[PDB]
Amino acid sequence: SDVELRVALPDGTTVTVRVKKNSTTDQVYQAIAAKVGMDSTTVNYFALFEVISHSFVRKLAPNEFPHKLYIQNYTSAVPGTCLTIRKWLFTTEEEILLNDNDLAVTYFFHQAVDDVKKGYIKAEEKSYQLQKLYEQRKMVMYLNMLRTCEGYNEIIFPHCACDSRRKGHVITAISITHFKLHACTEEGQLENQVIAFEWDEMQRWDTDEEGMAFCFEYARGEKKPRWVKIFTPYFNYMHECFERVFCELKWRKEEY
């Protein structure tokens, strides 16, 4: 059985693929990678996601069926589709290496632009300088500069409950440089407390399918390893993030 699937690309356009009905996510990602002409090395820098909200998209696990997701969320209105192609990458140096790949630059650029609009990348203090490079479509110079801002290549999650926060929520923020928990209120308004967890402090980590929680165990300073639970509905995505970070740290090819 063949079915069509619509998927959004970082530039706001959509692409349609004719794909087997029970395809898994990687299979659909490979069909999409081919129709837009990603090369053998670009294909490893992007992955399939599901739009959850205006401010959050979630990575599809390997064992999902994108067509099921697509129909579940389909209507005749919509800006288009709930499936989207987004960068999957934590170390910005492997990005710099692709600066002479027009496809990847274009995708990196349009996503970075939209993550600026959304507040993910904190470019405020050079906003005008960045604006000027955007207007002239000097894409690589915009990116080489935006890549120095706070929040570049950081995955921010919706606020939720944490078993080591008696009242209030956390917003978890994940990057190659560390694991941050931001204290926010009940409704998600930021307090002003925050905790940076070094990745080498991360001892082990799990999910809890039934409690719907991600779990991580850290040894910091000198105390004895302690468990923290985050009651996020996206525990699998957050688990994929830990695995991906440790993977990228093992293969970090630069001292800076």
Binding site: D163, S164, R165, R166, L181, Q193, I195, R226, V228
Partner: peptide, 7 residues
């Protein structure tokens, strides 16, 4: 549980 934001 002990609160990690205890300061």
């Amino acid at each position: 549980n002990i609160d990690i934001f205890a300061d």
